[PDB]
Structure 1
Amino acid sequence: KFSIYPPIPGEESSLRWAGKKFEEIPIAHIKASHNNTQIQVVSASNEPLAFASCGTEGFRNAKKGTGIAAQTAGIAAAARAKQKGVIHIRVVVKGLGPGRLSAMHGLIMGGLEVISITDNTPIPHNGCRPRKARKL
């Protein structure tokens, strides 16, 4: 009953959501930064659908990456997407912050349903030595 296992693209994905193949569902990039949150729904062919960031909401400070503001931004992005035809999306989370689950909840409220919780966060295997330590 719905195998969460990696759905390989081999013959053949026999699961459609209102006429949509898993190998063609529009992508939804949600950068969950520490003190910021952005909603950039990039289509498969790199097209726009809902680039509604917290900067356009009104505030340009730490108020970006929060809960209620992030959910409102996600709802606005979901409305903008539904105005163009999207509904189903493959969330691509980036970074760890308040804009991780609140954005998904706002998108669900708007109307967009999530089918996969993908996360391509930056995992440097001892590569880029991060910023030095800091004190309080």
Structure 2
Amino acid sequence: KEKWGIAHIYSSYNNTIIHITDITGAETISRWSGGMVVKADRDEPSPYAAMLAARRAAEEALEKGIVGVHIRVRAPGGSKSKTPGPGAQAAIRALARAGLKIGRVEDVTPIPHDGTRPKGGRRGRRV
């Protein structure tokens, strides 16, 4: 019939990870990060690295019979930043251009109800 999967996208200020699994989440189809396609640490979070990694992952998934995906995009969350980096939308767009159908899109950043304390002291980074 139709084999649908899930694309988990992890976006921070330092890197991007694109991880395609099956509908239940328990079996991995492909997994590509920014440091696997570019050679400079400075370029790992850039949008272009996101496009390259997304294209590699989409090809590997298409060869194995996946037809479309649902998307789950997240920032680090927790006691770290709640805002996704610059490579989220670029990764989302490059999946559709590569041949997959796109289902529903949502963000699953984990948000505390007044949880743990953040690193940096009571004055924070002083640069």
TM-score calculated relative to the size of structure 2: 0.80
Q: TM-score, normalised by structure 1?
A: 0.75
Superposed CA RMSD in Å reads 1.8
Query: 1:69 matched to which residue of 2?
Result: 49
On the 8 A contact 2:14/2:44 being kept in 1, the answer is yes
Partner of 1:47: 27
The structure where strand makes up a greater share of residues is 2
Identity of aligned residues (%): 33
User: How far is the alpha carbon of 1:45 from its aligned partner?
Assistant: 4.9
Q: Is the 8 A contact 2:8 2:19 kept in 1?
A: yes
Q: Once the two structures are superposed, what CA deviation does each residue of 1:37-82 show, in whole Å capped at 9, x if it has no partner?
A: 0011122251121211122214261311111111111111111110
Task: Give the aligned partner of residue 102 of structure 1.
Answer: 90
| Mapped partners of 1:52, 1:62: distance in 2 | 17
Runs of 4+ with >6 A deviation: none
User: Which 5+ residue runs of structure 1 have no aligned equivalent?
Assistant: 1-18
Provide structure 2 residue ranges, at least 5 long, that are not aligned to the other structure: 76-83
- Following superposition, the deviation at residue 131 of structure 1 comes to 2.3
- Residue number in structure 1 paired with 2:58: 78
Q: Number of residue pairs matched?
A: 115
Q: CA deviation at 1:101?
A: 0.4
The amino acid that maps onto 2:17 is: Q
1: CA distance between counterparts of 2:100 and 2:5? 11
